[PDB]
Copies of this chain bind each other. A is one copy, B any other.
Amino acid sequence: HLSKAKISKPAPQWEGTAVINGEFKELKLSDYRGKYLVFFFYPLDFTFVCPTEIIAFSDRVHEFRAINTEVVACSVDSQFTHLAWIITPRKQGGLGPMKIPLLSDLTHQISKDYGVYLEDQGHTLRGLFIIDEKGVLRQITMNDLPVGRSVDETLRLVQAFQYTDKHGEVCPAGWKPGSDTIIPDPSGKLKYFD
């Protein structure tokens, strides 16, 4: 397994054509500097788990935008196929109008750079990446094909990284806003453990 994606290092640069509000637009990772970004890959347009994940993030995108965070989805399908899918009604396994960009990776170069490409199948697995305002990679989540991801877990992780960025204390297992934190010092730590 080879990849350019390394936690605590700058996330690999990407550029491509995206569908945004029904139109074709050029989009780059660098466009997102100054904000957190949830960047996620899904296997294939017109399939099964995939539309449930894209719909989940689009319907709840306001929750991420309230905390200076954007969301971008990506597959190996072309931009013409993405638009056809957006126009397909939800009842027929389509998406309907979308509030997040759908990026196209026809050459497979972006998938390969992020280490999510399946050479035997010709598409990606379910891989999600959390990137900070400075462009640095903080988190990687990857699922086998039959099991979808969680919007709730994704929000929890974004909130935790922002908190530790700001305060310099660290977040225990299962942390949510309001939970106890730890001072990362051999003496300071006892204020939590006591």
Partner-B contacts on A (CB < 8 A): 1-8, 44-49, 52-53, 55-56, 76-78, 80-81, 83-85, 88, 90-93, 105-108, 115, 118-123, 125, 138-153, 156-157, 160-161, 164, 170-175, 182, 184, 186, 189-190, 193-194
B115 touching A1 by the CB < 8 A rule? yes
B147 touching A164 by the CB < 8 A rule? yes
Q: How far is the CA of A90 from the CA of B97 in the complex (A)?
A: 23
A76 touching B106 by the CB < 8 A rule? yes
CB-contact partner of A173 in B49, B106, B193, under 8 A = B49
Contact of A148 with B122 at beta-carbon distance under 8 Å, contacts A81-B77, A83-B46 already known = no
Contacts of A156 in B (CB 8 A): 150
Contacts of A123 in B (CB 8 A): 78, 106
Taking the full assembly, how many copies of this chain does it contain? 10
Chain B nearest CB from A182 CB (Å) reads 5
A164 nearest in chain B by CB position: B146
Most chain B CB inside 10 Å of its own CB: which residue of A120, A149, A173:
A173
Contact of A121 with B106 at beta-carbon distance under 8 Å, contacts A91-B194, A170-B48 already known = yes
Chain B nearest CB from A124 CB (Å) reads 11
CB-contact partner of A119 in B45, B49, B107, B144, under 8 A = B107
Q: How far is the CA of A53 from the CA of B173 in the complex (A)?
A: 5
Q: How far is the CA of A53 from the CA of B170 in the complex (A)?
A: 13
Task: List 11 A-B residue pairs with CB atoms under 8 Å apart, sorted by A's residue number.
Answer: A7-B143, A46-B78, A46-B84, A48-B184, A84-B84, A84-B88, A91-B194, A92-B194, A146-B161, A146-B170, A150-B173
